[PDB]
Each structure stands twice: as C-alpha cells, then as structure tokens.
Design a protein around this ligand. Structure first.
Ligand code: GSH
Ligand code: GSH
Ligand code: EAA
Ligand code: EAA
Ligand code: CA
Ligand code: CA
Ligand code: CA
Ligand code: CA
Ligand code: CA
Ligand code: CA
Lengths: 209, 209
C-alpha cells in the first residue's frame, strides 16, 4: 500500500479485487476515468496494454485484473496452504475468467440476440463450481481448502452478476446458493456490498446487465 | 511427475507448457485425443470445464493451460525471484493470454474476413512486450528478471505463431526478434523445436495458421 484503483465508473473487472480488499480490512483510493477522458487518449497511450484497470500498490504499478487478484492473493496470504492448493486456486480462477469473458462478450457485443442461448447454456457453465464445492468439505467452507482465496472473491462476483442476468440461475445449485449467502454475510464484505461505493456503480458500462 | 499431457493432436494451448518441460529437462507422456473420440462425449463429460488440455502431475489432475503453466512455474522455480517479480510474470502472462484469445478467435471464427484487420492491429499488440524487454536489462535476458519464467515460454510461443501468421511482423521489434532467436537456441529447447513431436503437429485444429 497505499492502494489505488484506476478504472471506469463501473463494477466490471474491479468488482472482485475491491471485495477482496474490503473483506481483508484494506483501504484504497478510487481514481475514476470517464469515457470522455479515456477518449482524449493520453492515459490510454500510457497503459501497458492500452486498457484499464490500472492498480497502484505503493511504487508498484500493475495492469491486468487477474494479475491484481494474484498479487493481492500472494501478498495477503489468499492463495491456498500448499503449492497444490495454489494450483487448484488458479484452476478455479481461470474457470471464472473464461465464463467472465463469455459474459462480457454477451453484454458488449450481442445482448439482445445472444441472451436466450447464453441462459440455456448457463447451468452447464455453473455446474463445475458446484462440483468443486461438493468435493471440498461438503461445500461448507471455500472453493479451495479451508481458507478464503482470491478465487473466492472472483467466483462470488461472477455468481452475483449472473443472478442479475438470470434471476434464479443458482436455485438448482444448493452449494453455490448457500456459498453466495455465507460469503456475502462476512461482516466487512457485507458492509462493503451495502455501501454507496459498490451500490451506486453499474455492473457494466453500456447500461446492460 | 510423472507428467501426462492430454490434448488434441495440435500445438495449440499446449505448445508453451511443452517447450517449458523440454527446456527444463523434464519428460512427459502425450495422450492424444482424436476429434472422433472427443465427439463420443465420455472424456469431455469427465473434464472439469468440458475442455482440453488436461494435465496429470503424479496424482494431481489439472485443467486450464495457464493453470498448468503457473503450476510448472511454481514447482520448477520459473516464477521470478520474489513476490514483485511474480506479479510482473503474471502481468506478462495475462497479456500473452489476451492476444492468444484474439489469435484463436481469428483462426477459429473469422480467418478470411478478419486477417487484414488483425494484421494491421498486430504491431500495437506486439509493442507492449518490446517495451517490457526494453525496460529489463536492455532486452538481453528474459521478459521478467534475470531468470526464465513460465511467461517466457508462453510469450515465445505467441511470437512464433504470429511470425507464421504474419511473416516479418517482428522485423520492427529488435528486442523481440533477438529474444526469439536467443530462447530458441537454448540447447534443450532447440532440440525439442526440431523434433518430430513438435514439427509434425499442426499449430491449430482447422488447417489454418
Ligand atoms: N485482460 C483484461 C483487460 C481489461 C479490459 O478489457 N479493459 C477494458 C474495460 S474492462 C478497457 O480498458 N477497454 C477500453 C479500451 O480498450 O480502449 C483484464 O483482465 O484486466
Ligand atoms: N481456458 C482454456 C480452454 C481450453 C480450450 O478452449 N479447449 C479447446 C481446445 S484448445 C476445447 O477443448 N474445445 C473442445 C470443446 O469445447 O468441446 C485453457 O486455457 O486451457
Ligand atoms: C468494463 C468493460 C467490460 C467489463 C468494458 O469493456 C468497457 C469498455 C469501455 C468503456 O468506456 C471507454 C470508451 O471509450 O468506450 C467502459 Cl465504461 C467499459 Cl465498462
Ligand atoms: C483452440 C483451438 C484451436 C485454435 C480449439 O478451440 C480446438 C477446438 C476443437 C478441436 O477439436 C475437437 C472437436 O471435435 O471439437 C480442436 Cl483439435 C481444437 Cl485445436
Ligand atoms: Ca476508499
Ligand atoms: Ca490465509
Ligand atoms: Ca433458491
Ligand atoms: Ca428450482
Ligand atoms: Ca529459476
Ligand atoms: Ca528482421
């Protein structure tokens, strides 16, 4: 620290890392980039891959939302107990990323025509995470092992936004459903999720969810 | 170990982890899945996310190409010298993955109509990695720090397939151009890249490159 998040005024790809920081009792600054500022081009030209989020951790500048999550995971001890658990954490996170990419593609490029197909496909996309829970202490703790990892925050966000996209998509998955409630009830995360800094942001940039 | 790679008969998303293993003096088994076996459904239904590669490391079963890379990076010590370098390695790898996804989309969904636009955009997509090299010991070592990392193998693969797609795309990037020659000349990697194991597989599954 100090931590600074540089992003558009949306939840988007910063939603998980923010929940992680909040739940872990961390402070951070939000630096907001508007569409009009971004379009000027100067900040963009300055970004490693021409994209946001950009994250500052003291004198470390990072790009890439999953790099930020892994960095915070490593430095705050949210990466499993073992090298083997570490591997499982990554496997979960990469799964979350794949589905997030499909979600973003729908939202940004094909919402109206694509939604029906996406929703029909959704149970089979959610099922792997229910299966992972079923294989770890009866679904009663976390996605990997017996402590929270960065993948938990990422998966929680993915599940939250899919309940907005498709209300009741978790009803067929008792472990995922209970998991969402149990993690959302963690006191620091509960407060953050109720706070204007979360509540008063849209999920995406184009008005769709 | 022992290591097993379960994949289609292509370089694809196993190309980097295979270079990594060969370069590190590791042996592994290739278990080949044909289009016909895959279409039968049994193996696919058994895969965590319904996809390949699948990787065995002794009694550990992994899915997700970047999970496998990070696992090998972690267990073989190809993950930077400290936590800050680990973050930089992830940042590189996540950048490589974004471009790989764009490349795969071109190849699979839009080769004929998309190639011109893709190739025009290519220098802007390659420049960040030239910049990273320029910022690390004048480009003379590795993408991050002074030791090879899993992201080096993934980046080298990305550069190799783009030279096939767009011959001469690296001519404007002297550090990237030299980096490709230098890593490819590493003795164990050199031998692997010249071997039937590599040479006799197509890059992708649809006859395009
Ligand atoms: N690989 C992604 C990239 C982030 C990304 O897609 N950024 C978008 C908003 S979430 C963006 O900056 N688009 C603006 C532009 O490309 O000009 C990550 O995980 O951070
Ligand atoms: N997230 C990817 C996914 C792998 C993937 O897209 N697999 C393709 C071949 S490279 C596949 O198994 N397609 C068959 C199918 O979906 O049925 C990874 O990094 O491993
Ligand atoms: C957040 C996104 C997906 C999670 C995204 O793709 C995105 C892209 C461009 C954006 O504006 C900048 C512009 O000039 O359009 C905004 Cl606000 C967003 Cl949210
Ligand atoms: C990444 C890929 C290549 C650029 C890819 O998606 C892919 C998908 C299906 C495939 O066949 C199996 C089948 O019958 O679907 C194969 Cl061989 C590949 Cl390589
Ligand atoms: Ca704050
Ligand atoms: Ca912990
Ligand atoms: Ca319910
Ligand atoms: Ca029901
Ligand atoms: Ca090393
Ligand atoms: Ca040249």
């Amino acid at each position: 620290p100090p931590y600074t998040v540089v992003y558009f005024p949306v939840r988007g790809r910063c939603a998980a890392l923010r929940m992680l920081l909040a739940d872990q009792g961390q402070s951070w600054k939000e630096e907001v980039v508007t569409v009009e500022t971004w379009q000027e081009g100067s900040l963009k030209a300055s970004c490693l891959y021409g994209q946001l989020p950009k994250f500052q951790d003291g004198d470390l500048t990072l790009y890439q939302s999953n790099t930020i999550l892994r960095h915070l995971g490593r430095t705050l001890g949210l990466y499993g107990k073992d090298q083997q658990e570490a591997a499982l954490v990554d496997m979960v996170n990469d799964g979350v990323e794949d589905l997030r990419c499909k979600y973003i593609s729908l939202i940004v490029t094909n919402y109206e025509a694509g939604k029906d197909d996406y929703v029909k496909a959704l149970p089979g996309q959610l099922k792997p995470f229910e299966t992972l829970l079923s294989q770890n202490q009866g679904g009663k703790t976390f996605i990997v092992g017996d402590q929270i990892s960065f993948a938990d925050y990422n998966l929680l966000d993915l599940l939250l936004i899919h309940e907005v996209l498709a209300p009741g998509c978790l009803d067929a998955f008792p472990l995922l459903s209970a998991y969402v409630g149990r993690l959302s009830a963690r006191p620091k995360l509960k407060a953050f999720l109720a706070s204007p800094e979360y509540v008063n942001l849209p999920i995406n940039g184009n008005g769709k969810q």
